Paper text:
In this study, two new extracellular bacterial AAOs from S. deajeonense and S. hiroshimensis (SdAAO and ShAAO) were produced as active proteins and biochemically and structurally characterized. For alcohol oxidation, FAD-AOx utilize the flavin cofactor as the hydride acceptor, which is regenerated upon reaction via aerobic oxidation, yielding H2O2 as the by-product. In both proteins, the FAD-binding domain consists of a five-stranded parallel β-sheet interrupted by a three-stranded antiparallel β-sheet that connects with two antiparallel β-strands, along with seven α-helices.
Numbering used by the authors: 3 to 520
The structure:
């Protein structure tokens, strides 16, 4: 079946692009998604998101053994349903810092400066909270303050205050380089509001949009230097105008390589026929890494066991109580060196502990390396389109990353030692060992660090002439006509924020690049 545009992947970016491109009734748009409809309860309920790990809603990737982590493999959940990862994520809308775009503008020009992207980002947002927030007030994605924050969360913010991190008046993504805040949420009335909710669903009555679920794309079909369609298991979808890969940091890169687009020698070694030499495909992989500082609680921890009759009754009646929590209720930003300037550390407050020793009754500060120097890549394991690719982030390959995380763990410890928090905790929650000496701390970081689910950069944007660029500033794959990538893969440098915002923004930006308004 024949379309004008074939979009692969109904995720953060792909939902936006399907909705936007189908706004013109004279173009026919296909949105092709490996997963099914987002129908399960645990998709809707903020507190339930982590229960989707290892389910049909999750691709369930893992990294290769990581030398920087002592040989550990790291689990890589990815959403596999309408809305993609926006349907399984932790609902945090934490859109990053204006300076994050300096390396994008360096790579791809003023099209990708902050001034250019800002309206697209603000345009995605509909803030439901108090005035003075930085967020937009008219976009498809409802952004809300928490309905029922844990009582300890105010204490975390007070502790931050005591340690010189003041509360941000606009929320994260404001002018303040340093500070703390309640997490802005992708929630409407206490339930998830995903890209499928905000963008896709309103568009699905359109006669010119076909949403095709349950279909993993195997490769892009190339003919005479142009993408002509995509191959599913049993049939081909044709595109008269463009194929747009929105399959994310894993899937977009894997699909390029499976199509013969990438480094010819490596593709040959994986059993794939090279078609377009583009060595940057799968390279420049970046991700946030976090270490959880977990303490045993001396107070009630509702989020340790949120799914109870009482909480279900309150959620049903009022959409309040623990089930309305995304768990990661507050954030703080700082520099390891204590300077002014853009943050290189984030602290995430979760009033729970992943610790069986205390039955979950603990409190966590996740310490986040926002600007890793480590880099990795994704390659094919072989030519089977159903096989997972080989994911090697190179976590903690750079020793500076270890030192930065060590500094952040010291700061988290400082917070738990603060007047506002120390009364709430009594020792560490195993397997967090609590305070250790300097050398021990470096080893502990390597033993405990894990993904924070923000992988980017495998289909990096850049100007013609930049040998490891994958797409151009208009998101067109270099050396192919009628083929674009629009998702988190194109990001040159991992931001100082959580990447759902960036993916949505790229979706919006891509739609305007492909079909300018007016
Ligand atoms: C568990 C988890 C928690 C997270 N928490 C947050 C958070 O709270 N806040 C935040 O800002 N970010 C968070 N993130 C990250 C954020 O959700 C992602 O970075 C963002 O959604 C990526 O958008 P995307 O469009 O690039 O890809 P995705 O949204 O992953 O979309 C890719 C889509 O393509 C589909 N696909 C892939 N390959 C194929 C194929 N071959 N054929 C067909 N379809 C295919 C996938 O199934 C998926 O639906 C989280 C991520 C995860 C996994």
């Amino acid at each position: 079946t024949a379309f004008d545009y074939v979009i692969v992947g109904a995720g953060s970016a792909g939902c936006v692009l399907a909705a936007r491109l189908s706004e013109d009734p004279e173009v026919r748009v296909a949105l092709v998604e490996a997963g099914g409809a987002d129908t399960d309860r645990a998709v809707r309920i903020p507190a339930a998101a982590a229960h989707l790990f290892g389910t049909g809603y999750d691709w369930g990737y893992s990294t290769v053994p990581q030398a920087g982590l002592g040989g550990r493999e790291v689990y890589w959940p990815r959403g596999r349903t309408l809305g993609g990862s926006s349907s399984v994520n932790f609902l945090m809308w934490v859109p990053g810092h204006a300076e994050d775009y300096e390396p994008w503008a360096r790579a791809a020009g003023d099209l990708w400066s902050w001034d250019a992207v800002r309206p697209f980002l603000r345009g995605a947002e509909h803030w439901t909270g108090g005035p003075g927030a930085v967020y937009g007030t008219e976009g498809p994605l409802w952004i809300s303050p928490p309905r029922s924050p844990d009582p300890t969360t105010a204490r975390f913010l007070q502790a931050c205050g005591e340690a010189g991190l003041k509360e941000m008046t606009g929320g994260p993504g404001g002018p303040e380089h340093s500070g703390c805040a309640l997490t802005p949420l992708n929630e409407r009335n206490g339930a998830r509001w995903s890209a499928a909710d905000g963008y896709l669903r309103p568009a699905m009555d359109r006669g010119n949009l076909e949403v095709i679920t349950g279909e993993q794309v195997h490769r892009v079909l190339l003919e005479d230097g142009r993408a002509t369609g995509v191959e599913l298991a049993g049939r081909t979808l044709t595109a008269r105008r463009e194929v747009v890969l929105s399959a994310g940091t894993v899937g977009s890169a894997q699909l390029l390589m499976l199509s013969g687009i990438g480094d010819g020698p490596q593709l040959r070694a994986a059993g794939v026929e090279p078609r377009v030499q583009l060595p940057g495909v799968g390279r420049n992989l970046q991700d946030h890494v976090a270490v959880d500082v977990m303490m045993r609680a001396t107070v009630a921890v509702p989020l340790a066991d949120p799914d109870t009759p009482a909480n279900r009754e309150l959620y049903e009646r009022e959409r309040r109580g623990p089930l309305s929590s995304n768990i990661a209720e507050a954030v703080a930003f700082l520099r390891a060196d204590g300077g002014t300037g853009a943050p290189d550390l984030e602290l995430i407050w979760a009033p729970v502990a992943d610790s069986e020793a205390v039955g979950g009754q603990g409190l966590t500060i996740a310490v986040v390396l926002l600007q890793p120097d480590s880099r990795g890549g994704i390659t094919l394991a072989g030519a089977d389109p159903s096989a997972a690719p080989l994911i090697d982030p190179g976590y903690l390959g750079a020793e500076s990353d270890v030192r930065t995380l060590a500094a952040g763990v010291r700061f988290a410890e400082r917070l738990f030692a603060a007047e506002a928090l120390r009364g709430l905790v009594d020792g560490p929650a195993a397997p967090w060992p609590g305070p250790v000496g300097d050398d021990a701390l470096e080893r502990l970081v390597r033993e405990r660090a894990s993904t924070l689910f923000h992988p980017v950069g495998t289909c990096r944007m850049g100007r013609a002439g930049d040998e490891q660029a994958v797409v151009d500033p208009w998101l067109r794959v270099h050396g192919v006509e009628g083929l674009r990538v629009a998702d988190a893969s194109v990001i040159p440098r991992v931001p100082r924020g959580h990447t759902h915002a960036h993916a949505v923004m790229i979706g919006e930006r891509a739609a305007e690049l492909i079909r300018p308004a007016g």
